[PDB]
Design an enzyme around this catalytic site. Sequence first.
Site, PDB file in Angstrom:
ATOM      1  CE1 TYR A 194      -3.757   0.332  -6.508  1.00 38.85           C
ATOM      2  CE2 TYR A 194      -1.053   2.204  -6.977  1.00 38.85           C
ATOM      3  CZ  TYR A 194      -2.347   2.357  -5.627  1.00 38.85           C
ATOM      4  OH  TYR A 194      -3.558   3.176  -5.731  1.00 38.85           O
ATOM      5  CB  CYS A 248      -0.397   6.960  -7.822  1.00 32.84           C
ATOM      6  SG  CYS A 248       0.461   5.585  -6.964  1.00 32.84           S
ATOM      7  CE1 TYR A 271      -3.457  -2.310   0.240  1.00 34.32           C
ATOM      8  CE2 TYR A 271      -2.310  -3.367   1.721  1.00 34.32           C
ATOM      9  CZ  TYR A 271      -3.903  -2.987   0.512  1.00 34.32           C
ATOM     10  OH  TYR A 271      -5.015  -4.221   0.328  1.00 34.32           O
ATOM     11  CB  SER A 272       0.877   4.490  -1.649  1.00 33.79           C
ATOM     12  OG  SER A 272       0.689   3.676  -3.210  1.00 33.79           O
ATOM     13  CD  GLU A 330       4.587   2.252  -6.167  1.00 32.69           C
ATOM     14  OE1 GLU A 330       5.385   1.929  -6.639  1.00 32.69           O
ATOM     15  OE2 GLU A 330       3.900   2.656  -5.609  1.00 32.69           O
TER      16      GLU A 330
HETATM   17  C1  LIG Z   1       3.130  -0.662  -5.200  1.00 33.51           C
HETATM   18  C2  LIG Z   1       1.006  -0.969  -4.654  1.00 33.51           C
HETATM   19  C3  LIG Z   1       0.739   0.465  -4.105  1.00 33.51           C
HETATM   20  C4  LIG Z   1      -0.469   0.145  -4.299  1.00 33.51           C
HETATM   21  N1  LIG Z   1      -1.082   1.152  -3.384  1.00 33.51           N
HETATM   22  C5  LIG Z   1      -2.369   0.897  -2.741  1.00 33.51           C
HETATM   23  C6  LIG Z   1      -2.584   2.010  -2.150  1.00 33.51           C
HETATM   24  O1  LIG Z   1      -2.342   3.002  -1.526  1.00 33.51           O
HETATM   25  N2  LIG Z   1      -4.287   1.575  -1.720  1.00 33.51           N
HETATM   26  C7  LIG Z   1      -4.693   0.866  -2.087  1.00 33.51           C
HETATM   27  O2  LIG Z   1      -6.437   0.504  -1.297  1.00 33.51           O
HETATM   28  N3  LIG Z   1      -4.134  -0.376  -2.680  1.00 33.51           N
HETATM   29  C8  LIG Z   1      -2.903  -0.296  -2.941  1.00 33.51           C
HETATM   30  N4  LIG Z   1      -2.851  -1.576  -3.774  1.00 33.51           N
HETATM   31  C9  LIG Z   1      -3.157  -2.206  -4.370  1.00 33.51           C
HETATM   32  C10 LIG Z   1      -2.826  -3.045  -3.277  1.00 33.51           C
HETATM   33  O3  LIG Z   1      -2.031  -3.641  -2.591  1.00 33.51           O
HETATM   34  C11 LIG Z   1      -4.007  -4.661  -3.020  1.00 33.51           C
HETATM   35  O4  LIG Z   1      -3.678  -5.089  -4.921  1.00 33.51           O
HETATM   36  C12 LIG Z   1      -5.324  -4.689  -2.766  1.00 33.51           C
HETATM   37  O5  LIG Z   1      -5.409  -3.212  -2.583  1.00 33.51           O
HETATM   38  C13 LIG Z   1      -6.702  -5.507  -2.821  1.00 33.51           C
HETATM   39  O6  LIG Z   1      -5.646  -6.560  -2.431  1.00 33.51           O
HETATM   40  P1  LIG Z   1      -6.939  -7.715  -1.451  1.00 33.51           P
HETATM   41  O7  LIG Z   1      -6.615  -8.485  -0.879  1.00 33.51           O
HETATM   42  O8  LIG Z   1      -7.806  -6.628  -1.328  1.00 33.51           O
HETATM   43  O9  LIG Z   1      -7.280  -8.655  -2.226  1.00 33.51           O
HETATM   44  P2  LIG Z   1      -7.147 -10.094  -3.257  1.00 33.51           P
HETATM   45  O10 LIG Z   1      -7.877 -10.878  -1.870  1.00 33.51           O
HETATM   46  O11 LIG Z   1      -5.900 -10.764  -3.664  1.00 33.51           O
HETATM   47  O12 LIG Z   1      -8.059  -9.902  -4.558  1.00 33.51           O
HETATM   48  C14 LIG Z   1      -7.285  -9.672  -5.095  1.00 33.51           C
HETATM   49  C15 LIG Z   1      -7.314 -10.114  -6.986  1.00 33.51           C
HETATM   50  O13 LIG Z   1      -8.856 -11.055  -6.811  1.00 33.51           O
HETATM   51  C16 LIG Z   1      -8.699 -10.051  -8.191  1.00 33.51           C
HETATM   52  N5  LIG Z   1      -9.344  -9.381  -9.023  1.00 33.51           N
HETATM   53  C17 LIG Z   1      -9.819  -8.016  -8.193  1.00 33.51           C
HETATM   54  N6  LIG Z   1      -9.687  -6.809  -8.599  1.00 33.51           N
HETATM   55  C18 LIG Z   1     -11.346  -7.868  -9.940  1.00 33.51           C
HETATM   56  C19 LIG Z   1     -12.233  -7.399 -11.000  1.00 33.51           C
HETATM   57  N7  LIG Z   1     -12.624  -6.031 -11.141  1.00 33.51           N
HETATM   58  N8  LIG Z   1     -12.224  -8.379 -11.440  1.00 33.51           N
HETATM   59  C20 LIG Z   1     -12.313  -9.963 -11.430  1.00 33.51           C
HETATM   60  N9  LIG Z   1     -11.218 -10.188 -10.770  1.00 33.51           N
HETATM   61  C21 LIG Z   1     -10.731  -9.498  -9.594  1.00 33.51           C
HETATM   62  C22 LIG Z   1      -7.500 -10.693  -9.051  1.00 33.51           C
HETATM   63  O14 LIG Z   1      -7.493 -12.325  -8.736  1.00 33.51           O
HETATM   64  C23 LIG Z   1      -6.723 -10.006  -8.147  1.00 33.51           C
HETATM   65  O15 LIG Z   1      -5.249 -11.110  -7.889  1.00 33.51           O
HETATM   66  C24 LIG Z   1      -1.382  -1.246  -4.397  1.00 33.51           C
HETATM   67  C25 LIG Z   1      -0.620  -2.086  -4.903  1.00 33.51           C
HETATM   68  C26 LIG Z   1       0.645  -1.899  -5.062  1.00 33.51           C
HETATM   69  C27 LIG Z   1       1.060  -2.793  -5.720  1.00 33.51           C
END
Ligand SMILES: Cc1cc2nc3c(=O)[nH]c(=O)nc-3n(C[C@H](O)[C@H](O)[C@H](O)COP(=O)(O)OP(=O)(O)OC[C@H]3O[C@@H](n4cnc5c(N)ncnc54)[C@H](O)[C@@H]3O)c2cc1C
Length: 295
Positions: free
Chosen positions: A295, A253, A71-72, A293
């Site tokens: 994601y 971003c 997360y940023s 960046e």
């Molecule tokens: C460098 C970086 C910085 C980030 N900064 C932030 C930030 O500041 N704030 C923030 O909220 N997030 C940020 N993110 C994204 C964050 O890391 C997580 O990916 C995001 O919060 C979702 O994680 P989760 O555990 O909620 O979801 P998971 O439970 O892992 O669900 C995600 C998975 O489900 C699927 N999926 C997701 N969306 C969809 C869709 N529309 N349709 C179908 N399948 C889908 C994919 O398989 C994905 O891998 C950042 C990511 C990176 C890489």
Amino acid sequence: DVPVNLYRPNAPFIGKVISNEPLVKEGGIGIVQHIKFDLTGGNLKYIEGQSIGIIPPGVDKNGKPEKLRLYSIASTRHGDDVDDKTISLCVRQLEYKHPESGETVYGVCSTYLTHIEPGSEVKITGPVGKKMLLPDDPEANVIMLATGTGIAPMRTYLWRMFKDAERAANPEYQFKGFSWLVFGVPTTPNILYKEELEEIQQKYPDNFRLTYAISREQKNPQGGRMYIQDRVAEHADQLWQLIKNQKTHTYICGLRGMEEGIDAALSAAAAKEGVTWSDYQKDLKKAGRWHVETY
Ligand SMILES: Cc1cc2nc3c(=O)[nH]c(=O)nc-3n(C[C@H](O)[C@H](O)[C@H](O)COP(=O)(O)OP(=O)(O)OC[C@H]3O[C@@H](n4cnc5c(N)ncnc54)[C@H](O)[C@@H]3O)c2cc1C
């Protein structure tokens, strides 16, 4: 000198949630929360433009432990209270469609974070990242193209630049360049940190320009919903002429899918002067002046 991986996932910092405040107002789409963590008891230090890992509890569908999510960082090195004791995140609850088995699917780490209570302990790793650092040059120009939660690194730049308490805490960084935020969200209640963004633009009308692209409230010249790429198209010539300055940096971003429209607009701008943007942009990337960046 940049702090990195002071904490790693095999032995993460156990921080504690101080606060969990809503950023999306009534009438808006989705849930984005501002969450602030207590860093006392350990030595997590960080600067602007970096990220941290959060490891959510539980196992996945295969029974394996859950991994970290990045997360940023949404705060400056000093934290929101400028005490050097905390760190903040800007977390949007991921939820999506039926054709991913079920009906509405909720993301593991994002739901966990957006619903986490003050007083709860969290596994935190990091910081990580050197792609999105802010130059120490006070005369730098800073273009900021952000959508949704890509606001978070922008907030760390802007707060360090323009917050009274930050200026007083950073004798060396007294920003006097120009900064321009183009921020893309679907509604007006979905403008995260709207009050503070607009207040910054009031104090510093010559040093900060704030531009919105609100899709559900604004149409581009083609009659479609307004996006960040449309505002960059609309201001492409200005944005190109700022980019020509040796001191100008650009940050992008947000969720992936914005970079193409931004490039095609700056491609048409640069071409007017016999420059192919994609190659000029290669040099900006090597120079450390083109930060992305998504994601
Ligand atoms: C460098 C970086 C910085 C980030 N900064 C932030 C930030 O500041 N704030 C923030 O909220 N997030 C940020 N993110 C994204 C964050 O890391 C997580 O990916 C995001 O919060 C979702 O994680 P989760 O555990 O909620 O979801 P998971 O439970 O892992 O669900 C995600 C998975 O489900 C699927 N999926 C997701 N969306 C969809 C869709 N529309 N349709 C179908 N399948 C889908 C994919 O398989 C994905 O891998 C950042 C990511 C990176 C890489």
